[PDB]
Amino acid sequence: SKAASLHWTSERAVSALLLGLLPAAYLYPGPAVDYSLAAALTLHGHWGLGQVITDYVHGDTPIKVANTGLYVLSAITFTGLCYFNYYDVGICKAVAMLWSI
Amino acid sequence: TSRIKKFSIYRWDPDKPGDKPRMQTYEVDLNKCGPMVLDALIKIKNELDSTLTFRRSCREGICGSCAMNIAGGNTLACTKKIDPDLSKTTKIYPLPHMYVVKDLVPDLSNFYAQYKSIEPYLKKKDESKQGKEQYLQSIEDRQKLDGLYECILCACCSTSCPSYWWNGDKYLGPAVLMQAYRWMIDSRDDYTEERLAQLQDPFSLYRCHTIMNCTRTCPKGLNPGKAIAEIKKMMATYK
Amino acid sequence: STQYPVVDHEFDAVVVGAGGAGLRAAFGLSEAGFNTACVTKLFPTRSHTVAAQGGINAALGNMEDDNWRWHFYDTVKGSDWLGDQDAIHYMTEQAPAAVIELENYGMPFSRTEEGKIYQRAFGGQSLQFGKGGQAHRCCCVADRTGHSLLHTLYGRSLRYDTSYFVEYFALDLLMENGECRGVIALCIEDGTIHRFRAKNTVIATGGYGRTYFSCTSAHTSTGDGTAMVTRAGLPCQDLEFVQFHPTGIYGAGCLITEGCRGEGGILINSQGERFMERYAPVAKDLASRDVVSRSMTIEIREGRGCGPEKDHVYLQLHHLPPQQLATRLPGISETAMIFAGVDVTKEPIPVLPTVHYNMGGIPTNYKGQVITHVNGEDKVVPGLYACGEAASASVHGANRLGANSLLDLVVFGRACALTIAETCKPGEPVPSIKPNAGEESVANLDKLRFADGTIRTSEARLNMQKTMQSHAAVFRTGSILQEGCEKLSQIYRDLAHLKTFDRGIVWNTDLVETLELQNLMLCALQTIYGAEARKESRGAHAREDYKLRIDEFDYSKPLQGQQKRPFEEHWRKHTLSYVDVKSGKVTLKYRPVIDRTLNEEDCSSVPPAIRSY
Amino acid sequence: ATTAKEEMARFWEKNTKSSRPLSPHISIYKWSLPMAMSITHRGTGVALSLGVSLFSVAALLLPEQFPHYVAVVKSLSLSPALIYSAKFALVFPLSYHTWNGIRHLVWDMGKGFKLSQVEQSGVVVLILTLLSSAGIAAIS
């Protein structure tokens, strides 16, 4: 019954989180932050592109198709980031290394 | 010593459908015309082309009839000063992204139906004593309606909202949502929760992305963007 | 015809007009169970009612103690005894109930410290039958009362199954045997012709201020309903009584509410003098409109006008606290800035008397039923009603009191509905009309559509407006009225030479404005001929060649031993006007004013007396 | 009498099958900084998202690990000016989106809605974006 306002509320909460993870990534690099960013970046992004789809895509089929695709992209994205955090240096460290060039 | 001003106006005749929409230029001597764009429009129709068509009624910006797009912005022609720079041509178009009936006349029927859909009338849990005594309202509670009840339903704001352009079939739009807020906070209305429940879907209220074109274009100086933000806050906290 | 597609509708009732009156009558019929149609040339909230400012009168007693019989008295005197006391009685007594209804609909009235409806002072209203000082009974929504009243009534109408035909232009009544059986109209969106058949028709089309060159009126106040009555061969009444509002803004003509004076504003001339203290020692700037307008006009005539052309005067509000201006008069504060570049907290507004409202209209009884007058007797026209500015009940007589019109709309809009419901039953059979009924309306419409004469519509309309402005203004005289009459008669004959250009049918405003011109001209002819015949001064009609009000007795002296004047020898009577539409010949007749109230014992009749403020 | 829902349906049935044109919108509406910033906030968000997705997919598909490509780049001894420029281009969209995003969250708290505040906050967001971006491009 309140799914719409709940979603709107969730989106803001996640946006806030991301905001806090920025400073956190700088002050406390490491797994905790690395995985949180992986989750927040994926979720904030999924919902955002979701809003973009709702605005511009119309027609029942085109919309279902567009949303199935987005869901596929989000899954792959979250997987790749976790994989990178696991088998490689991790997001926080990758950024510092990239900035040392 | 005339001051010839040029106006380029959108034209389309339903009775000669095949002729594509075009712009027609008219030359008007400002020394023999009132100061507002509507004055020029009426002068053109009375002296230069009586086929030019537009809605109008009050001449003082209270009826809402003459809304149109002048120099890129939606506004009321009857209160819009003509730009006296004779080197510039003023372009006049119908309200944006609307179906044109003829010339500057848009079809506002979806707009009115959206307004009807939010039940813009006082509802109390028990209406059987209606007509017997004045309902009491404090000065402080009445003041909450300032900035909301003055809307003249011209549709300048809604037709300036990109979201209403792309989703006007399901997005109620700024004018309607602000009137919904106006009944939500009327201390005499007892259906606030229900008014809020009606917006629990992805489009009615939520296509608003705080672009703020609506508030910038209102000829009455109102702020529907702010009103929409207040609804979102109530939607997030109500029980 | 055969060339225009015709659509037929059957309803229990048809209301022409969606202003305050039309809407109130329309949903009033629907709430009583009648299958009702409301035909309007404009989307409802665009009607002139939306522009009303000052307020609506009712003896609620929210500010000080009141009595509706005092409001009855102020209205009778204000009308200069041309008003029918039975209708005035009904209107003032029903006023408190009517305002409470609107507030219970949600109208956002301004509030007092007790949470009740805020009421302001207004022109020509007193306590204690004119003996006790200024009344404060004008209920308002700051200075946008009309806007709120109309939007509130429109929202309410959304709760009923009334069928609305928006942007449909009514052309004529469907008459048969002296009975009205509906109306024929043009659907502006698609060009089709529609016939609305119904046992009862309510005309709520507004006034005709647009017959003048300068007016506070909308471009759409063209007397279309009054003209339909005239074309059906029925009489209109008291059309020569035209109200000039004291304060239309100089130039634009936009109304500056009388609420300004109700809240303390004052009129001053070029010498800074508060001149109403001289014309109306007691009432001052809150004297009746006919008196303030004439006083302002004399100030200007006598050289004390302001501006480079010394052609207007000033309305001063800056001595008032800016919080009061913002709370009570925010609307005109904006308007003054937009149309005169004036900041009301610092400088005065330039103003001048401006055509504003029509006291005359279609004659009705106090129940809203349209009447005709045959062999010295009033007779009801079966199935025809009228309310609002288009009707002459007559609650306003020779001069309407500010804030009594919005009251008039809801009270009589409601009365028409009540009367029909206590007279007929929903579902009764719909009256018949000949198969070609309305054909002459369609032929006239086709004639203007293809008119290829020599005088375009805007040219003839401007001629009409300038003639009226300069031959039937605040002060009038026999020879100027006569030249005006002949001028209008010629302009009327010259309509044979009309020229239009738009040959389309969808939204052909070139055509609709030519139809409105024919309507305006019929109203104007009657106004000016009636004025020329009325050789006396009464309320808004001032003759400099006939300066006294002429009653059946000389009420300035004792009646004891006086010889009553024969009906044909005095002027306290309503003018009934008729027009032979093909020729334009105007015929004038007279009917008596009704002095009896609805109950002598509860509200006694007010005999004529000297009228002074 | 017709319900709001029936009116909306007839509205679309009537117009979609009519010859009425749709009045211009995007090609004639006058722009404003707030409107431009609005499209830009959407543009940066999408760019940022496609960036994260591309990186995520590169991590799952590329042969070598991250340090390897970092070293390869360092070995090319590219001009520090060019590298500074690239750092600026990388942090710009994220900085813009971040500051403007905060501007949005303040609106969601119902603050800053007066036209003057809307214009002012937008200009502040542009300055903060340029300062932080220039500060970070020169490393942190």
Ligand SMILES: *Cc1cc2c(cc1C)nc1c(=O)[nH]c(=O)nc-1n2C[C@H](O)[C@H](O)[C@H](O)COP(=O)(O)OP(=O)(O)OC[C@H]1O[C@@H](n2cnc3c(N)ncnc32)[C@H](O)[C@@H]1O
């Ligand atoms: C002009 C004016 C009048 C006025 C006022 C301010 C201004 C600027 N302020 C007032 C106030 O504060 N208090 C008050 O008592 N009166 C005030 N007035 C006068 C008063 O407002 C008017 O007399 C009153 O509004 C009358 O309204 P009414 O219901 O009689 O009609 P209307 O609003 O003018 O609307 C007319 C309707 O009829 C329709 N129409 C007209 N012709 C046709 C045709 N041909 N076919 C179909 N419909 C027709 C119009 O569409 C409209 O809906």
Ligand SMILES: CCCCCCO[C@@H]1O[C@H](CO)[C@@H](O)[C@H](O)[C@H]1O
């Ligand atoms: C190409 C991107 C630049 C942004 C366009 C700025 O556009 C300007 O914005 C200001 C402030 O809102 C308005 O007052 C002006 O009328 C408008 O032209």
Ligand SMILES: CC1=C(C(=O)Nc2ccccc2)SCCO1
């Ligand atoms: C619908 C919407 C945007 C939009 O489409 N803006 C826009 C598009 C085209 C032309 C002007 C503005 S930008 C902010 C998110 O919401």
Ligand SMILES: O=C([O-])CC(=O)C(=O)O
């Ligand atoms: O006509 C009226 O009754 C009142 C009006 O114009 C005003 O607000 O001054």
Ligand code: SF4
């Ligand atoms: S909010 Fe302003 S722009 Fe929108 S309809 Fe109302 S008056 Fe017109």
Ligand code: F3S
């Ligand atoms: S322009 Fe549109 S997106 Fe929201 S703030 Fe105004 S309704």
Ligand code: FES
């Ligand atoms: S004509 Fe009434 S708002 Fe312009």
Ligand SMILES: [K+]
């Ligand atoms: K409430």
Ligand SMILES: [K+]
């Ligand atoms: K009247």
